[PDB]
Amino acid sequence: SPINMESVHMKIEEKITLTCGRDGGLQNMELHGMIMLRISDDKFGRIRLHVENEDKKGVQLQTHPNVDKKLFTAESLIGLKNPEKSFPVNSDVGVLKWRLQTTEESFIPLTINCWPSEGCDVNIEYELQEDNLELNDVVITIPLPSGVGAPVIGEIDGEYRHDSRRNTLEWCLPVIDAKNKSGSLEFSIAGQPNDFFPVQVSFISKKNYCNIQVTKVTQVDGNSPVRFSTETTFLVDKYEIL
C-alpha cells in the first residue's frame, strides 16, 4: 500500500542463476539486479539518489537511458541527464541495473557439498561464503530413489520433510548467518550416488547479494535531504548442484 511507502520509494531486486558441479566447481553464475524508483508526489520529481557501492565482485552497472551516466560514474549519484526534467510520478522507472556473470567459485554465496557413499549413506553440508548475507527459509531439495521406502535420518542441523510422491527430501534451515555459516545432514536409503542429484537450493534474502544501497535522496534544487523508503529482495531463479 502507498500508505506504507514514502513519497520516494525504491524496490531493489536481484535474482541469481547458478549451476554447480557436485565436485564443487562453478559451471555458471549469473546475477541480475535493478533499482526500481517510484515517486507518488511531483514534489519529489527532481531528485538525485545517492548510491553506496561496497561491492568488489566486478559487477557491471548500467544506468537508464534518461539517467546521467557521467554523474553516476564520477559521483555515484542517480539523476536525470536533464536536471530540469522530472522523474515520472506513479510509474516505476528502472533507473539502474547490474549484472554479474562468472565461473569463479569464490563468488558462490552458499556452497553445497553432497557426498553419497556406498545401503547408501548420504552426507551433505552447506557453508556460507558471504558473511554479509542472512539467508531465510533455506530449503535444500534432495531427490531420492523410488520404490525403496523412506530415508532414515541421522545427524541433522535444522529440519526436514520427506515426500513419498515426489521422491524428495527437503532439508530446511537453520537460519544461515555469518555467525552460523555451516551445517550438515546425514541420512541413509538404498540407492546410488546419481540418485541424489540434481540438488536444488531455494532461499530468499532481504539483503542484496551485491553490496549496493541507496543511502540518501536529495532535491536537485538546493540539495536538501528527502525521506525515502526501500524494499530489498534477493531471490533464486535457479540454484542447482549437478
XYZ file of N, CA and C in Angstrom:
726
model
N 0.818 -1.210 0.000
C 0.000 0.000 0.000
C 0.854 1.262 0.000
N 0.417 2.292 -0.748
C 1.128 3.579 -0.779
C 1.285 4.191 0.616
N 0.362 3.868 1.522
C 0.411 4.373 2.897
C 1.660 3.858 3.644
N 2.210 2.720 3.211
C 3.399 2.157 3.847
C 4.703 2.656 3.232
N 4.598 3.486 2.199
C 5.776 3.920 1.461
C 6.011 5.405 1.627
N 7.259 5.830 1.566
C 7.485 7.258 1.489
C 7.103 7.687 0.079
N 6.990 8.988 -0.145
C 6.678 9.504 -1.470
C 7.801 9.250 -2.477
N 8.976 8.865 -1.969
C 10.079 8.365 -2.795
C 10.386 6.952 -2.333
N 10.222 5.989 -3.218
C 10.322 4.602 -2.824
C 11.057 3.799 -3.867
N 11.952 2.938 -3.409
C 12.710 2.104 -4.321
C 12.570 0.634 -4.005
N 12.368 -0.166 -5.038
C 12.424 -1.620 -4.901
C 13.741 -2.080 -5.492
N 14.565 -2.718 -4.682
C 15.850 -3.180 -5.173
C 15.816 -4.696 -5.201
N 15.785 -5.255 -6.406
C 15.574 -6.686 -6.584
C 16.693 -7.335 -7.364
N 17.167 -8.471 -6.857
C 18.209 -9.257 -7.510
C 17.745 -10.685 -7.659
N 18.183 -11.335 -8.729
C 17.885 -12.743 -8.952
C 19.184 -13.473 -9.250
N 19.379 -14.672 -8.693
C 20.561 -15.442 -9.060
C 20.200 -16.708 -9.842
N 21.066 -17.034 -10.790
C 21.001 -18.243 -11.580
C 22.346 -18.883 -11.416
N 22.369 -20.082 -10.863
C 23.646 -20.688 -10.565
C 23.571 -22.186 -10.805
N 24.624 -22.703 -11.432
C 24.812 -24.129 -11.643
C 26.206 -24.535 -11.174
N 26.255 -25.570 -10.340
C 27.489 -26.091 -9.766
C 27.625 -27.576 -10.079
N 28.842 -28.045 -10.364
C 29.101 -29.479 -10.414
C 29.136 -30.023 -9.000
N 28.870 -31.311 -8.836
C 28.866 -31.884 -7.498
C 30.266 -31.887 -6.903
N 31.269 -31.793 -7.779
C 32.668 -31.637 -7.381
C 32.913 -30.303 -6.664
N 31.974 -29.372 -6.815
C 32.090 -28.055 -6.205
C 32.505 -26.968 -7.180
N 32.775 -27.346 -8.425
C 33.178 -26.370 -9.424
C 31.988 -25.546 -9.889
N 32.228 -24.276 -10.183
C 31.152 -23.420 -10.668
C 31.063 -23.468 -12.188
N 29.987 -24.057 -12.692
C 29.734 -24.095 -14.133
C 29.262 -22.733 -14.660
N 28.349 -22.115 -13.923
C 27.837 -20.819 -14.321
C 27.143 -20.116 -13.176
N 27.472 -18.839 -12.990
C 26.723 -17.983 -12.079
C 26.332 -16.701 -12.796
N 25.063 -16.333 -12.666
C 24.571 -15.101 -13.251
C 23.771 -14.378 -12.201
N 24.077 -13.110 -12.027
C 23.337 -12.299 -11.100
C 22.767 -11.104 -11.852
N 21.468 -10.852 -11.713
C 20.841 -9.667 -12.292
C 20.137 -8.888 -11.218
N 20.312 -7.572 -11.244
C 19.647 -6.716 -10.283
C 19.164 -5.419 -10.888
N 18.213 -4.787 -10.221
C 17.840 -3.440 -10.616
C 17.239 -2.659 -9.478
N 17.358 -1.339 -9.580
C 16.665 -0.427 -8.686
C 15.467 0.158 -9.417
N 14.278 -0.110 -8.893
C 13.060 0.459 -9.442
C 12.597 1.607 -8.561
N 12.506 2.799 -9.147
C 12.132 4.035 -8.451
C 10.664 4.389 -8.674
N 9.984 4.762 -7.602
C 8.591 5.147 -7.682
C 8.327 6.347 -6.791
N 7.816 7.397 -7.404
C 7.543 8.652 -6.753
C 6.043 8.906 -6.780
N 5.452 9.245 -5.641
C 3.997 9.415 -5.583
C 3.560 10.871 -5.449
N 4.512 11.791 -5.552
C 4.240 13.219 -5.376
C 5.213 14.053 -6.211
N 4.686 14.808 -7.174
C 5.543 15.572 -8.079
C 6.466 16.538 -7.319
N 6.199 16.745 -6.028
C 7.097 17.485 -5.142
C 8.518 16.895 -5.139
N 8.609 15.593 -5.388
C 9.901 14.921 -5.363
C 10.305 14.423 -6.737
N 9.828 15.102 -7.778
C 10.117 14.675 -9.139
C 11.537 14.950 -9.595
N 12.200 15.911 -8.953
C 13.518 16.351 -9.406
C 14.517 16.117 -8.293
N 14.932 14.859 -8.199
C 15.757 14.365 -7.124
C 16.949 13.601 -7.663
N 17.904 13.345 -6.780
C 19.045 12.503 -7.084
C 19.223 11.446 -5.989
N 19.548 10.225 -6.395
C 19.693 9.122 -5.451
C 21.169 8.925 -5.193
N 21.537 8.790 -3.936
C 22.924 8.547 -3.595
C 23.160 7.062 -3.436
N 24.046 6.514 -4.265
C 24.259 5.069 -4.306
C 25.570 4.692 -3.674
N 25.489 3.879 -2.636
C 26.679 3.449 -1.937
C 27.068 2.079 -2.475
N 28.307 1.947 -2.929
C 28.751 0.698 -3.538
C 29.948 0.148 -2.799
N 29.746 -0.949 -2.070
C 30.848 -1.603 -1.361
C 31.167 -2.935 -2.010
N 30.759 -3.102 -3.266
C 30.931 -4.390 -3.919
C 32.302 -4.542 -4.582
N 32.909 -5.708 -4.414
C 34.195 -5.957 -5.051
C 34.142 -7.127 -6.030
N 32.944 -7.484 -6.480
C 32.804 -8.629 -7.375
C 33.013 -8.298 -8.853
N 33.097 -7.013 -9.197
C 33.243 -6.636 -10.597
C 31.902 -6.676 -11.314
N 30.863 -6.326 -10.577
C 29.533 -6.211 -11.143
C 29.495 -5.098 -12.192
N 28.848 -5.358 -13.328
C 28.615 -4.347 -14.369
C 27.345 -3.546 -14.121
N 27.486 -2.238 -14.023
C 26.359 -1.357 -13.752
C 25.907 -0.639 -15.018
N 24.597 -0.525 -15.210
C 24.069 0.203 -16.361
C 22.962 1.150 -15.949
N 23.129 2.437 -16.255
C 22.108 3.432 -15.961
C 21.040 3.437 -17.049
N 19.807 3.692 -16.643
C 18.674 4.008 -17.521
C 19.088 5.047 -18.574
N 18.605 4.889 -19.799
C 18.883 5.859 -20.870
C 18.551 7.328 -20.546
N 17.648 7.612 -19.613
C 17.365 9.016 -19.278
C 18.327 9.532 -18.190
N 19.082 8.620 -17.590
C 19.932 8.918 -16.426
C 21.343 9.354 -16.826
N 21.861 10.383 -16.151
C 23.181 10.942 -16.427
C 24.277 9.928 -16.102
N 24.894 9.396 -17.140
C 25.878 8.344 -16.959
C 27.164 8.869 -16.299
N 27.613 10.044 -16.696
C 28.840 10.567 -16.123
C 28.639 10.951 -14.662
N 27.469 11.496 -14.356
C 27.153 11.832 -12.981
C 27.244 10.574 -12.117
N 26.721 9.452 -12.613
C 26.743 8.231 -11.813
C 28.167 7.721 -11.664
N 28.904 7.726 -12.766
C 30.292 7.244 -12.826
C 31.253 8.006 -11.878
N 31.142 9.332 -11.836
C 32.076 10.156 -11.085
C 31.609 10.344 -9.641
N 30.299 10.458 -9.462
C 29.761 10.872 -8.166
C 28.865 9.817 -7.517
N 28.589 8.735 -8.242
C 27.723 7.669 -7.729
C 26.354 8.247 -7.316
N 25.920 9.296 -8.033
C 24.558 9.829 -7.930
C 23.705 9.444 -9.135
N 22.456 9.081 -8.870
C 21.497 8.800 -9.937
C 20.612 10.021 -10.149
N 20.742 10.679 -11.292
C 19.932 11.846 -11.620
C 19.663 11.845 -13.118
N 18.651 12.585 -13.567
C 18.326 12.628 -14.990
C 19.367 13.462 -15.739
N 19.632 13.105 -17.000
C 20.500 13.867 -17.901
C 20.146 15.347 -17.959
N 18.855 15.609 -18.045
C 18.318 16.951 -17.945
C 17.821 17.182 -16.515
N 18.609 17.899 -15.697
C 18.250 18.070 -14.282
C 16.907 18.767 -14.113
N 16.476 19.512 -15.127
C 15.203 20.233 -15.032
C 14.016 19.341 -15.384
N 14.303 18.165 -15.922
C 13.270 17.197 -16.224
C 12.848 16.525 -14.920
N 11.595 16.105 -14.835
C 11.135 15.395 -13.654
C 11.071 13.880 -13.882
N 11.307 13.099 -12.836
C 11.031 11.678 -12.948
C 9.529 11.511 -13.077
N 9.087 10.383 -13.645
C 7.657 10.089 -13.737
C 7.018 10.003 -12.363
N 5.756 10.396 -12.243
C 5.024 10.226 -10.985
C 3.997 9.090 -11.061
N 4.010 8.235 -10.042
C 3.247 6.990 -10.003
C 3.459 6.123 -11.238
N 4.724 5.809 -11.492
C 5.136 4.972 -12.607
C 6.529 4.478 -12.300
N 6.728 3.163 -12.332
C 8.023 2.583 -11.979
C 9.100 2.926 -13.012
N 10.289 3.328 -12.568
C 11.399 3.544 -13.504
C 12.590 2.736 -13.076
N 13.120 1.919 -13.974
C 14.322 1.162 -13.667
C 15.538 2.062 -13.867
N 15.894 2.872 -12.866
C 16.978 3.850 -13.008
C 18.358 3.222 -13.096
N 18.506 2.011 -12.566
C 19.799 1.347 -12.556
C 19.647 -0.155 -12.598
N 20.558 -0.826 -13.308
C 20.567 -2.277 -13.407
C 21.968 -2.746 -13.244
N 22.146 -3.986 -12.802
C 23.502 -4.516 -12.829
C 23.520 -5.973 -13.208
N 24.694 -6.449 -13.592
C 24.832 -7.828 -14.000
C 26.204 -8.341 -13.598
N 26.226 -9.584 -13.140
C 27.461 -10.313 -12.922
C 27.311 -11.687 -13.530
N 28.257 -12.057 -14.377
C 28.336 -13.420 -14.863
C 29.752 -13.902 -14.626
N 29.892 -15.092 -14.045
C 31.206 -15.544 -13.626
C 31.281 -17.049 -13.353
N 32.476 -17.614 -13.479
C 32.681 -19.004 -13.101
C 33.657 -19.130 -11.934
N 33.945 -18.018 -11.258
C 34.837 -18.047 -10.087
C 34.082 -18.542 -8.849
N 34.433 -19.744 -8.381
C 33.792 -20.370 -7.210
C 33.775 -19.460 -5.987
N 34.791 -18.612 -5.892
C 34.911 -17.631 -4.826
C 33.634 -16.786 -4.641
N 32.863 -16.631 -5.712
C 31.644 -15.826 -5.668
C 30.374 -16.608 -5.288
N 30.466 -17.927 -5.115
C 29.296 -18.693 -4.690
C 28.860 -18.197 -3.319
N 27.598 -17.808 -3.190
C 27.163 -17.273 -1.896
C 27.066 -18.383 -0.852
N 26.530 -19.517 -1.280
C 26.296 -20.635 -0.389
C 26.745 -21.926 -1.058
N 27.868 -22.488 -0.625
C 28.345 -23.730 -1.235
C 27.648 -24.936 -0.654
N 27.408 -25.919 -1.515
C 26.784 -27.168 -1.126
C 27.737 -28.331 -1.394
N 27.992 -29.146 -0.380
C 28.893 -30.282 -0.529
C 28.159 -31.580 -0.213
N 27.681 -32.268 -1.252
C 26.941 -33.523 -1.097
C 27.843 -34.721 -1.409
N 28.035 -35.628 -0.449
C 28.862 -36.823 -0.649
C 28.091 -38.108 -0.395
N 27.518 -38.723 -1.441
C 26.983 -40.077 -1.293
C 28.119 -41.078 -1.144
N 27.902 -42.173 -0.426
C 28.892 -43.247 -0.364
C 28.221 -44.578 -0.078
N 28.623 -45.608 -0.813
C 28.018 -46.932 -0.684
C 28.606 -47.721 0.478
N 22.607 -49.575 0.170
C 22.937 -49.198 1.531
C 23.662 -47.867 1.568
N 23.209 -46.947 0.724
C 23.880 -45.668 0.540
C 23.752 -44.721 1.748
N 24.882 -44.172 2.170
C 24.898 -43.103 3.156
C 25.112 -41.799 2.421
N 24.261 -40.828 2.694
C 24.429 -39.525 2.103
C 24.794 -38.529 3.190
N 25.903 -37.825 2.980
C 26.291 -36.712 3.839
C 26.330 -35.440 3.023
N 25.585 -34.440 3.460
C 25.540 -33.187 2.724
C 25.709 -32.034 3.704
N 26.516 -31.045 3.327
C 26.732 -29.890 4.182
C 26.684 -28.621 3.341
N 26.404 -27.511 3.996
C 26.488 -26.209 3.355
C 27.509 -25.370 4.082
N 27.966 -24.303 3.430
C 28.806 -23.303 4.065
C 28.550 -21.942 3.443
N 28.255 -20.963 4.286
C 28.011 -19.608 3.814
C 29.336 -18.920 3.539
N 29.530 -18.430 2.319
C 30.793 -17.773 1.947
C 30.761 -16.272 2.205
N 29.676 -15.631 1.785
C 29.495 -14.200 2.004
C 28.895 -13.926 3.384
N 29.757 -13.605 4.349
C 29.330 -13.293 5.713
C 28.304 -12.146 5.765
N 28.228 -11.368 4.692
C 27.246 -10.297 4.573
C 25.796 -10.806 4.564
N 25.570 -11.974 3.974
C 24.206 -12.460 3.778
C 23.565 -13.045 5.027
N 22.248 -12.957 5.063
C 21.453 -13.613 6.082
C 20.322 -14.306 5.354
N 20.416 -15.624 5.248
C 19.504 -16.370 4.397
C 18.379 -16.986 5.212
N 17.157 -16.697 4.777
C 15.970 -17.254 5.397
C 15.220 -18.241 4.521
N 14.511 -19.136 5.198
C 13.686 -20.121 4.542
C 14.516 -20.885 3.529
N 15.751 -21.210 3.890
C 16.583 -22.029 3.024
C 16.040 -23.450 2.951
N 15.722 -23.883 1.738
C 15.336 -25.267 1.505
C 16.275 -25.913 0.517
N 16.912 -26.996 0.942
C 17.786 -27.750 0.071
C 17.050 -29.013 -0.318
N 16.652 -29.092 -1.578
C 15.888 -30.236 -2.028
C 16.744 -31.307 -2.679
N 16.652 -32.502 -2.106
C 17.456 -33.644 -2.500
C 16.567 -34.741 -3.063
N 16.753 -35.103 -4.346
C 15.982 -36.210 -4.940
C 16.369 -37.570 -4.365
N 15.424 -38.502 -4.326
C 15.664 -39.820 -3.725
C 15.293 -40.963 -4.673
N 15.956 -42.125 -4.543
C 15.496 -43.292 -5.302
C 14.087 -43.662 -4.892
N 13.332 -44.230 -5.821
C 11.965 -44.624 -5.531
C 11.868 -46.125 -5.302
N 10.754 -46.547 -4.720
C 10.486 -47.957 -4.526
C 11.301 -48.585 -3.417
N 11.946 -47.777 -2.576
C 12.769 -48.343 -1.503
C 12.497 -47.734 -0.119
N 11.281 -47.241 0.107
C 10.890 -46.722 1.408
C 11.446 -45.334 1.699
N 11.289 -44.888 2.941
C 11.693 -43.549 3.347
C 13.178 -43.501 3.707
N 13.821 -42.350 3.510
C 15.196 -42.237 4.006
C 15.220 -42.295 5.539
N 16.316 -42.758 6.129
C 16.456 -42.778 7.580
C 17.419 -41.679 7.995
N 16.922 -40.695 8.731
C 17.715 -39.505 9.012
C 18.584 -39.700 10.243
N 19.871 -39.401 10.121
C 20.775 -39.417 11.261
C 20.969 -38.036 11.865
N 22.221 -37.604 11.970
C 22.547 -36.273 12.481
C 22.054 -35.180 11.533
N 21.401 -34.155 12.068
C 20.889 -33.088 11.207
C 20.887 -31.733 11.888
N 21.308 -30.720 11.148
C 21.139 -29.352 11.586
C 19.897 -28.824 10.875
N 18.879 -28.425 11.630
C 17.639 -27.978 11.016
C 16.611 -29.093 10.966
N 15.659 -28.997 10.038
C 14.552 -29.954 9.975
C 14.405 -30.506 8.574
N 13.511 -31.471 8.387
C 13.312 -31.992 7.042
C 11.880 -32.354 6.765
N 11.624 -32.549 5.486
C 10.340 -33.019 5.020
C 10.575 -34.054 3.931
N 10.012 -35.241 4.128
C 10.127 -36.333 3.168
C 8.812 -36.481 2.443
N 8.873 -36.452 1.120
C 7.677 -36.529 0.300
C 7.705 -37.805 -0.531
N 6.797 -38.752 -0.268
C 6.888 -40.043 -0.955
C 6.528 -39.946 -2.436
N 5.618 -39.052 -2.785
C 5.154 -38.959 -4.171
C 6.205 -38.323 -5.071
N 6.821 -37.258 -4.586
C 7.837 -36.557 -5.357
C 9.186 -37.244 -5.254
N 9.296 -38.202 -4.332
C 10.593 -38.805 -4.000
C 11.656 -37.762 -3.702
N 11.366 -36.900 -2.734
C 12.313 -35.880 -2.325
C 12.495 -35.838 -0.828
N 13.666 -35.361 -0.440
C 13.957 -34.961 0.919
C 14.256 -33.457 0.868
N 13.362 -32.659 1.434
C 13.601 -31.237 1.623
C 14.296 -30.982 2.949
N 15.482 -30.390 2.881
C 16.256 -30.043 4.067
C 16.060 -28.557 4.366
N 15.484 -28.224 5.526
C 15.091 -26.843 5.828
C 15.953 -26.196 6.912
N 16.590 -25.073 6.559
C 17.263 -24.178 7.515
C 18.511 -24.863 8.116
N 19.011 -24.456 9.315
C 18.773 -23.369 10.288
C 19.070 -22.019 9.636
N 18.654 -20.910 10.242
C 18.952 -19.601 9.668
C 20.443 -19.575 9.359
N 20.800 -19.062 8.193
C 22.202 -19.090 7.823
C 22.779 -17.684 7.900
N 23.505 -17.433 8.999
C 24.137 -16.147 9.368
C 25.651 -16.238 9.275
N 26.315 -15.087 9.330
C 27.776 -15.047 9.407
C 28.270 -15.632 10.727
N 27.369 -15.720 11.697
C 27.713 -16.295 12.982
C 27.503 -17.798 12.930
N 26.783 -18.258 11.916
C 26.422 -19.671 11.823
C 26.472 -20.146 10.381
N 27.692 -20.232 9.884
C 27.952 -20.325 8.473
C 27.728 -21.729 7.910
N 27.675 -22.742 8.767
C 27.729 -24.112 8.262
C 26.806 -25.065 9.008
N 26.413 -26.147 8.342
C 25.582 -27.174 8.947
C 25.583 -28.418 8.075
N 25.092 -29.530 8.598
C 25.189 -30.757 7.836
C 24.021 -31.673 8.122
N 23.824 -32.614 7.206
C 22.717 -33.547 7.228
C 23.260 -34.895 6.819
N 22.861 -35.937 7.538
C 23.229 -37.291 7.174
C 21.995 -38.178 7.158
N 21.857 -38.988 6.120
C 20.743 -39.929 6.079
C 21.139 -41.129 5.273
N 20.322 -42.176 5.315
C 20.599 -43.361 4.504
C 19.327 -43.879 3.823
N 19.526 -44.516 2.680
C 18.449 -45.038 1.849
C 19.130 -45.856 0.772
N 18.467 -46.899 0.286
C 19.093 -47.791 -0.675
C 19.090 -47.178 -2.073
N 20.258 -46.779 -2.556
C 20.342 -46.154 -3.863
C 21.764 -45.995 -4.331
N 21.939 -45.256 -5.418
C 23.251 -44.986 -5.986
C 23.494 -43.478 -6.017
N 24.772 -43.056 -5.997
C 25.153 -41.641 -5.944
C 24.345 -40.735 -6.853
N 24.148 -41.148 -8.099
C 23.428 -40.310 -9.056
C 21.957 -40.130 -8.717
N 21.415 -40.968 -7.831
C 20.009 -40.812 -7.458
C 19.781 -39.508 -6.712
N 20.836 -38.983 -6.102
C 20.676 -37.824 -5.231
C 20.998 -36.490 -5.892
N 21.041 -36.474 -7.216
C 21.282 -35.224 -7.943
C 20.289 -35.131 -9.088
N 19.952 -33.915 -9.545
C 20.439 -32.606 -9.098
C 19.823 -32.144 -7.776
N 20.660 -31.570 -6.916
C 20.226 -30.907 -5.693
C 19.787 -29.478 -6.005
N 18.614 -29.080 -5.516
C 18.096 -27.732 -5.738
C 18.170 -26.926 -4.446
N 18.504 -25.653 -4.564
C 18.545 -24.778 -3.392
C 17.579 -23.622 -3.598
N 16.785 -23.339 -2.575
C 15.862 -22.215 -2.617
C 16.058 -21.352 -1.371
N 15.997 -20.042 -1.524
C 16.013 -19.154 -0.366
C 15.581 -17.762 -0.777
N 15.288 -16.911 0.204
C 15.009 -15.501 -0.077
C 15.659 -14.619 0.980
N 16.466 -13.664 0.532
C 17.238 -12.812 1.397
C 16.694 -11.402 1.309
N 16.727 -10.677 2.420
C 16.262 -9.298 2.424
C 17.442 -8.347 2.334
N 18.636 -8.906 2.242
C 19.815 -8.106 1.971
C 20.295 -8.471 0.577
N 20.743 -7.481 -0.184
C 21.206 -7.764 -1.529
C 22.530 -8.507 -1.545
N 22.706 -9.349 -2.552
C 23.962 -10.045 -2.751
C 25.045 -9.021 -3.108
N 24.762 -8.172 -4.092
C 25.646 -7.054 -4.394
C 25.574 -6.005 -3.304
N 26.727 -5.531 -2.867
C 26.751 -4.596 -1.763
C 26.483 -3.199 -2.279
N 25.268 -3.010 -2.778
C 24.826 -1.766 -3.402
C 23.558 -1.253 -2.710
N 23.589 -0.027 -2.188
C 22.424 0.537 -1.493
C 22.192 2.013 -1.827
N 20.943 2.436 -1.735
C 20.637 3.848 -1.803
C 20.578 4.342 -0.370
N 21.467 5.259 -0.026
C 21.597 5.699 1.356
C 21.024 7.083 1.559
N 20.876 7.828 0.472
C 20.334 9.177 0.591
C 19.610 9.602 -0.683
N 18.634 10.486 -0.543
C 17.968 11.080 -1.675
C 17.904 12.583 -1.461
N 18.340 13.373 -2.443
C 18.352 14.833 -2.294
C 17.640 15.564 -3.434
N 17.143 16.762 -3.140
C 16.495 17.605 -4.136
C 17.536 18.137 -5.116
N 17.225 18.115 -6.404
C 18.141 18.710 -7.371
C 18.357 20.192 -7.043
N 17.285 20.865 -6.672
C 17.378 22.284 -6.356
C 17.614 22.509 -4.863
N 18.847 22.836 -4.489
C 19.167 23.086 -3.094
C 19.732 21.900 -2.323
N 19.705 20.712 -2.925
C 20.317 19.507 -2.339
C 19.845 19.108 -0.946
N 18.602 19.444 -0.599
C 18.044 19.066 0.695
C 17.701 17.577 0.740
N 17.980 16.923 1.875
C 17.647 15.520 2.120
C 16.150 15.292 2.045
N 15.771 14.108 1.620
C 14.387 13.805 1.339
C 14.090 12.422 1.910
N 12.978 12.279 2.622
C 12.555 10.983 3.140
C 12.363 9.975 2.024
N 12.798 8.741 2.248
C 12.599 7.690 1.256
C 12.490 6.342 1.953
N 11.901 5.367 1.276
C 11.826 4.001 1.788
C 12.371 3.031 0.745
N 12.747 1.829 1.164
C 13.265 0.856 0.218
C 12.728 -0.499 0.570
N 12.601 -1.341 -0.445
C 12.228 -2.737 -0.296
C 13.292 -3.531 -1.042
N 14.032 -4.372 -0.331
C 15.178 -5.041 -0.934
C 14.975 -6.531 -0.920
N 15.148 -7.175 -2.066
C 14.950 -8.611 -2.122
C 15.960 -9.294 -3.038
N 16.421 -10.455 -2.593
C 17.397 -11.251 -3.324
C 16.855 -12.675 -3.466
N 16.531 -13.053 -4.696
C 15.722 -14.249 -4.973
C 16.469 -15.260 -5.826
N 16.007 -16.507 -5.813
C 16.665 -17.544 -6.603
C 15.865 -17.926 -7.848
N 16.447 -17.738 -9.031
C 15.854 -18.277 -10.263
C 16.210 -19.750 -10.400
N 17.494 -20.051 -10.254
C 17.984 -21.426 -10.322
C 19.245 -21.560 -9.460
N 19.318 -22.608 -8.655
C 20.491 -22.815 -7.830
C 20.665 -24.314 -7.660
N 21.417 -24.913 -8.573
C 21.454 -26.360 -8.669
C 22.862 -26.937 -8.576
N 22.956 -28.115 -7.982
C 24.209 -28.833 -7.864
C 24.093 -30.106 -8.712
N 24.903 -30.230 -9.762
C 24.723 -31.288 -10.772
C 25.406 -32.596 -10.446
